[PDB]
Each structure stands twice: as structure tokens, then as C-alpha cells.
């Protein structure tokens, strides 16, 4: 009942889709571990966006059909535990991901109260919505393609290395 | 009369009401300058120059946001600054001065593309292209093949630029931010 112009018609799209992808990720990483939290968390947003756009335009003829599977003993579960994942799923649902996604790259005043990404963005926050970002990547395009598995050995030494 | 006439007619939510909220916006767009520096260095162009075009509309807001007047109620869709929707909310450019470090570092060519750019909008399509990728006639094309490593080292500098030539001066904390960015601009050219 739904379409776009952004239809996969190839595995080589996927392949390329996917890289892209592996580059935000490692972007996101590189702006995390030199302490920029906002802008990273802006890139982590976009790689959820990018990877529900890619999952569902393979199928195809807000937009965030990639809610990583939660499992107790799950990588993710004991990497930020049960108080985060609630808050970002809810936020996912409700869309209010949108709002802080802009909020971690644009100054705003909001009731006449200047607001920066540097005083809205925690370095907790900033670290939970990655791990979720690259666990999206992971549960909704790791394992369709051989390229995926390869690409998936550098998002797990990254996630490893941010979680622990 | 880029931006002149904004601040004259026009009102905004985003208005500027004092030096430390001023000060703010330019450690703000520091960062992301420094962002969009340290990306570009690892190689990240496309992404580079997605922030790089963000410092330009970020730059441009703040400068426009301390003179322009403020309207508390007026919406989103009908505030030029608030929205990055609207072209003219970058209208804040460098002083095109010929012998500075900008054309002697990029070349006259290219400032005017993208002021061409800038004025017609397509730098905000050039930014679009920087980030998400597209299925345009049945061909997906990705972020790092629209954008050149040569383009994401121009507009990082010119960003840097509108920063300086439309910001540094305003306040004494400036000046100490645009020593570091003098850094990054210089190590840029060489």
C-alpha cells in the first residue's frame, strides 16, 4: 500500500546502501571518542533513519522500521540496561528522536532560553542511541548478504569497544 | 542587499538578546567546525561537508538572529531562521575580497559556484546528497559519490570564513575562538 522512488532492486544497491551506513557508524564512533556527544548523536539518528529506510525500501514497491530485537543476555540489554532502551523506543514510537536529533546539531531558543547541543545531549545518551544505532544496522540488514557478515566484523569491534 | 533586508521586514523566535548567548552560538558553531575539520581529516567527505554546509545556515542564523526582531508567537513555517527549509537564512556570506585567504587557498571559480549554489539553493541539495543516499532514474547513487574530497575541503573553508569575516570582532571571547579556527583554516591550504 506504500512506495518510493528509493526501491532496492539489487543486491549491489543493498551492498552499497550498507556501506554507507558502516561509514556513519564509524563517523558517529570518531565524533563520540573525540568527546563531540551532540554531533555524534545527530549521525547516530540519521544511521537509524538510514538503516529503517534501507530495510524497508528492499521490501517496498515516523519511518523507523528498525527496533533492534531486545532479548534478555542481549549485547545491548547489559551495554546501557533496561532504563535506556525503554526511553529510546519510546521516543522512536513517538517520534521525539526527530526533536532531539535537531537539538544535538542546531542552536534554538525555545520559551526565550537559548539552546545548544553541547547543554541538551548527555555523553550517556550520546553512547546508549549509538550501541542502539549500530544493534539497528545489525538486526535489520546484518545476514542478507555475504558483504553484510564482513561489514559486521568492523560494527562489532566498534560496539565491543563502546560498551565495554 | 544579502540578508539587509531580512532583519528590516521580517521577524524570528531565534533573536539574540545578550553577549554570553552570542558567545553560545559561536562555541556551537566551533565545535562543529572542529567536526567537520577532524571528519574531513579521517577521510569522511561527504559527512564532512554535510556540517560544513550546517556551519554556513548555523553562522547565518546567529549573525541574522541578535538584529533581527523577535516575534515570541510567530510559527515555524513563518520564521526564516527557525526553518532550514528557506535559502535565505545562509544569505550571510564572507566579504569576497580578492588576495584573501580564501581565493588564494580555493581559487575565484569556485567561491562564486558556490554562492550560485548558495543563492539558487542547491546548497542545500548538495547538502542532502552529503548524508542520505537516493534512488534517482532507477540508479542509487550514495554520499560519497556526489561529493569530492576537493569539494569537502573548499566549503569547510569557506564556512570557516563566513564564521570569521561575519562573527569574530562582536565580542572578546571571539577572537579567542577564531585563533583556533585560523589553525585549522591555515592547516587546510598547506
Given at each position: 500500500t506504500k512506495e518510493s522512488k528509493?526501491?532496492?532492486?539489487?543486491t549491489d544497491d543493498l551492498n552499497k546502501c550498507i556501506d554507507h551506513i558502516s561509514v556513519l557508524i564509524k563517523d558517529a564512533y570518531l565524533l563520540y571518542t573525540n568527546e563531540s556527544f551532540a554531533t555524534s548523536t545527530f549521525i547516530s539518528i540519521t544511521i537509524i533513519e538510514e538503516v529503517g529506510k534501507t530495510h524497508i525500501g528492499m521490501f517496498i514497491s515516523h519511518?523507523?522500521?528498525?527496533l533492534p530485537t531486545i532479548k534478555m543476555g542481549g549485547r545491548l540489554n547489559k551495554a546501557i540496561g533496561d532504563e535506556m532502551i525503554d526511553k529510546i523506543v519510546e521516543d522512536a514510537e513517538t517520534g521525539e528522536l526527530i526533536s532531539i536529533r535537531e537539538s544535538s546539531l542546531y542552536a534554538d531558543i525555545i520559551d526565550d532560553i537559548l539552546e545548544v547541543p553541547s547543554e541538551k545531549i548527555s555523553k550517556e545518551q550520546s553512547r546508549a542511541l549509538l550501541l542502539y544505532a549500530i544493534e539497528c544496522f545489525d538486526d535489520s540488514l546484518?545476514?542478507?548478504?555475504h558483504h553484510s557478515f564482513e561489514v559486521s566484523e568492523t560494527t562489532d569491534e566498534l560496539f565491543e569497544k563502546l560498551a565495554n
Open positions: 528509493f526501491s532496492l532492486k539489487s519511518a523507523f522500521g528498525s546484518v545476514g542478507y548478504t
